[PDB]
Design a protein around this ligand. Structure first.
Ligand SMILES: [Mg+2]
Lengths: 63, 49
């Protein structure tokens, strides 16, 4: 969030209206989510034996 | 006659403001314009908060 505000301060000094800055972030947010959604894959095809492995993978990262 | 002071009676209780003269109704206009100054930039979809 602060990174978005740091890049917005540079655009405000250039004379851009703040609403035009917020309108660009809303359109760019949906383009990033739709791009990452196509790259990921579905792990639900695996059985319960492999499904436990994916739970161990994301556990060690949050710890 | 009850004292050498003999105070002068004031029509209104102490603390009351004054009026008439010139600019009394103008004081009410500048009060509404100053409040309007805050609500002007909030007009329009590109307005601020
Ligand atoms: Mg974490």
């Amino acid at each position: 969030a602060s990174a978005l505000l740091d890049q917005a301060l540079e655009l405000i000094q250039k004379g851009i209206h703040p609403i035009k800055i917020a309108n660009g972030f809303d359109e760019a947010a949906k383009l990033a989510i739709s791009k990452l959604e196509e790259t990921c894959d579905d792990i639900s095809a695996s059985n319960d034996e492999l499904f436990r492995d994916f739970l161990l993978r994301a556990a060690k990262t949050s710890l | 006659n009850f004292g050498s002071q003999t105070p002068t009676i004031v029509v209104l209780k102490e603390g009351t403001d004054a009026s008439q003269g010139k600019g009394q109704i103008i004081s009410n206009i500048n009060a509404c314009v100053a409040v309007q100054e805050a609500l002007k930039p909030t007009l329009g979809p590109l307005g601020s908060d």
